[PDB]
Structure 1
Amino acid sequence: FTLIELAIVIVIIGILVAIAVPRFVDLTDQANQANVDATAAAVRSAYAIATVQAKGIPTCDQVFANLEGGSTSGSTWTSSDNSTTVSCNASADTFTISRGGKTRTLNLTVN
């Protein structure tokens, strides 16, 4: 390369640097909260559907039977990507929904 071309390069490098560039940000807290909230809405609907199926107060299993996005092991349901959990305390008439420390609780009577 000629000295002129190198001089031009030395100029242009200095100008294509000293742009702004975005930071990466750990937005997983906000996303986890929305996941927990959307899951809580789904649990309420799944419970409501279960009260028709049960013709009365539903069992914990009847509620989780109506959730699509995951699998269940006795008294708990887990999203297929394992981070979101739902669980009953059937004696405490309560569902807890949680993901990455974000959490929500539904006080729905269940057996």
Structure 2
Amino acid sequence: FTLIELAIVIVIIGILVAIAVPRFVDLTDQANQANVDATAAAVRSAYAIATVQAKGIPTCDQVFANPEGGSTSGSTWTSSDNSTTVSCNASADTFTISRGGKTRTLNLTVN
């Protein structure tokens, strides 16, 4: 390594470490409301399929039979990963999807 070589490296490093570089903006909250919409779209469709199967106002278990990509337990379908609890309450007649703070309550006739 000569003296002149390092001098030229000092020049180049000054330029090449003097650039715009973007940072990690956390956009989970943005995607969570997108997720909770997309889930809520399926919950409507699943309910509409349950009504053809049940030929009447379907039960909350019959509604969660239709969605896939996540398991059920009692009366709360959660996604494959532990989020998006679409919890209903047949007495109240309403589903409520909630990814991670961002939520979306929808009211359908369940018994």
Structures share a fold, TM > 0.5? yes
Q: Give SS of 2:21's match.
A: coil
Determine the C-alpha separation between the residues in 2 that align with 1:83 and 1:51: 26
Spell out, residue by residue over 1:2-39, the C-alpha distance to the aligned partner (whole angstroms, 9 max, x if none).
00000000000000011000011110011000000000
**Structure 1 regions of 5+ residues with no counterpart?**
none
Identity of aligned pairs, percent?
99
TM-superposed deviation, 1:75: 1.1
Shift of 1:65: 0.1
CA distance in 2, matches of 1:25, 1:100: 17
Residue segments in structure 2 that go unaligned for 5+ positions in a row: none
The match for 1:104 is 104
Q: Distance in 2 between matches of 1:69 and 1:97?
A: 15
Question: After superposition, what is the alpha-carbon deviation per residue over 1:64-98, rounded to whole angstroms, capped at 9, x for unaligned?
Answer: 00001101111110000111110111000000000
Q: Distance in 2 between matches of 1:18 and 1:52?
A: 63
- Structure 1's consecutive aligned runs of 4 or more residues displaced over 6 angstroms after TM superposition are none
Residue 43 of structure 1: how far off its partner (Å): 0.1
1:89 corresponds in structure 2 to 89
| Higher relative strand content | 1
1:87 and 1:75 map into 2 onto residues whose CA distance is: 6
By how many angstroms is 1:100 displaced? 0.9
1:57 correspondence with 2:57: yes
